[PDB]
RNA sequence: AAAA
């Protein structure tokens, strides 16, 4: 019917008939008629409120799309070059077209126009037709369409497909055009969203990367992102000093990674590190639960965690960095005190010891010994001077100048912004506290079943 | 060269009955191809590509131009069953080995899969995604894939053969006016994703990290709008960092920018009254921290409010942190009620009568006898509270002895408490009692200040 | 290559 008309149109062009105008006179009334009757919309017709169409110099295409989507309000992203075809378009579709002028390659302004129209019509179904117009114009429209259904699920990118295309006439064969709704590539490639999780993980926003991954197991039915979620949850908890949780998640990950099904999960190409880390968490959670400094591995893990936390907060959470480093030094020092028999909270000071400690503290804080009251618990500076006086070897290596600086720092624990007190801690002092804590940490590391490994996270492997 | 002559002759020939496709192939295409073999016309500038990737439709001369212009060593050609035919013509024109991949004429998911693949296998090299030839659905699939993977494969350039004169009747570019053009990535240019992440962090409290995203947003967008945004997140970071001078500096900078002509319509101006208020609070706190004078009720209130809100944020996860913030807020609110009485918690000039009444107060509270109670030199949290109740303090006096009983273990929670002197994540209800007491004292203090949440980002 |  139309196929006969198309064959006779080809014959007509082969007779020297000018193909633009000949097509408009001969074929186009018939094809336009069929579409005004039964718009060919491939995955059945869909109910659209607004359609947005690029317009190029084949307005018949845009006509087909406008009828096919059947929208009420119709926008036409056209170029200065294709503006001249709006009137005929309007007369064909019998629709009032809101025109918008855009460059023929202004991908960017196309895309902004789509974001504008979408926000003008947020809750209603929208057909973004990219049929007519340059590839750049369609790139704008399609980038915006495929990106914005995350936020406007009712927005559908559409095109006028054909099932037969004439390469000499550079037209579809009349009657073989249909309007194909196009799927979003973020349906069957939801897995690619992992890179966002990979990025959220790569900045250390573990809590967020974990929520992202749990979404991934919910979005694309894969359970393998659940293992990533486990790892990220582990790091969030570990950074939070929630070693109980940190371990719960890490153990769950190592159990899953044990299974035959996850033998190939990329996290396995890091298992030696992962295992080490969860063991650290084990060591800490036991030590935290035991509170005895005999568990050198747990003390090491808590000290290394605290010092890691203070290091990464050294510039943008200075008061928090101080908190972390002060607690780390107290830990390492108290472990040193357990080594030499005693425990700082109720050390048994001999009177000779109390006088030795008072003399050291005096000639460290710059007072006469008779000004010195010994507190019942050894606080941080008392512990420092006392371990020094009991011959703790690593602490011996401290010449009285860096010791004086540490004493100055140490009086800022007794009062600070987050302690019962008021002063924001000097970053010089905090770095000195952390340098001494780091030295003790390495001493301790030389002494643990763990050996070395770091809080810093294992690669996702993807 | 004047292939313009040839193009006019080719037009002359078609208008007189000639086949446009064959005639283009014999008159125009040789000459045009000659010129593009000499000097490929790449708009921004030619750029070395490891790999170019071209959708191919029934106009292989387009993908030929695109191949020549991108000059990539390794050339994929996405094609359809219906366009596979032209692969030999393309091979001849480009003199280049091709890596054809067959795809459906509307297989947007597949262009997508293919880009994911080629990019993974060539992750760290410049790759041009040319969407010239083929269907709008084909180019659209390549473009979606490109603009998306560009973030993670930053050497990727989505490119396309533009033309400065398109013969609508020949449905062809006029020969010579074509040019290969790096299309801007709109996702990048607008940094919609960096915004979405920065919004996520900003809402979730990760102010410093949102700030870094905004600062990078400036460079990706060329729009200093996001500089202001960075400043805002900057200030909130410094504020939660408890560095109120840093927060005040940044906030004032921001208010000075939002005062300017350029940023009258900046979306943060939609909440300017808030910002103004908050920056005033910043100054209040900053003045008070500089003076430690508790007549500065607005500074004391702001800093107690800051601590109480940090202890609200952290209680879910930072748990220890949440208690430290709560204790600090309570000790603060308490020192302010105490300063209202002319007394300093730090050294109470308590007369021997007050010492007796405070040992007595703590005895009755804790249930022990008064000489079990040894009064410290600095009034501790519970001691401060019992001394305010001693001294006629109305809000603290309105606390039942059983409430103070249930609270006194919580105010014993200090020390212990992993980040202080022990190993305890103090109980969420332990933190709760402190935080609600502090909330009451905070609201009371808020009344006595003439001043009487981070602000929405506006997107 | 501005309905492949």
Numbering used by the authors:
A (entry chain B): 3 to 464
B (entry chain A): 2 to 453, 458 to 464
Source paper text:
Type III CRISPR systems are innate immune systems found in bacteria and archaea, which produce cyclic oligoadenylate (cOA) second messengers in response to viral infections. In these systems, Csm6 proteins serve as ancillary nucleases that degrade single-stranded RNA (ssRNA) upon activation by cOA. In addition, Csm6 proteins also possess cOA-degrading activity as an intrinsic off-switch to avoid degradation of host RNA and DNA that would eventually lead to cell dormancy or cell death. The two TtCsm6 monomers dimerize in an X-shape, and each monomer contains an N-terminal CARF domain, an intermediate helix-turn-helix (HTH) domain and a C-terminal HEPN domain.
Guided by this structure, we then identified a TtCsm6 variant Y161A, which displays a sustained cA4-activated RNase activity without cleaving cA4. We next co-crystallized TtCsm6Y161A with cA4 and determined the structure at a resolution of 2.9 Å. As expected, we observed a cA4 molecule binding in the CARF domain, which remains uncleaved as evidenced by its unambiguous electron density, indicating that the structure was determined in the pre-cleavage state. One significant variation is that, in this cA4-bound structure, we were able to observe the coordination of both the scissile phosphate and the 2ˊ-OH nucleophile, which are positioned by S60 and T59, respectively, resulting in an O2ˊ-P-O5ˊ angle of 159o. Furthermore, the contact of nonscissile phosphate with Y161 is abrogated due to the alanine substitution. Upon cA4 binding, the primary conformational change occurs in the CARF domain, where a mobile loop along with the two helices situated above the catalytic center switch from an open to a closed conformation, completely enclosing the cA4 molecule within the catalytic center. In the cA4-bound structure, the HTH domains of the two monomers move toward each other with a maximum shift of ~10 Å compared to the apo state. However, in the cA4-bound structure, the hydrogen bonds between N416 and H422 are disrupted, causing them to separate with each other by a maximum distance of 9.4 Å. Moreover, R415 also disassociates from E332 and exposes its guanidine side chain to the surface of catalytic center. This remodeling positions the R-X4-6-H motif into a catalytically competent conformation.
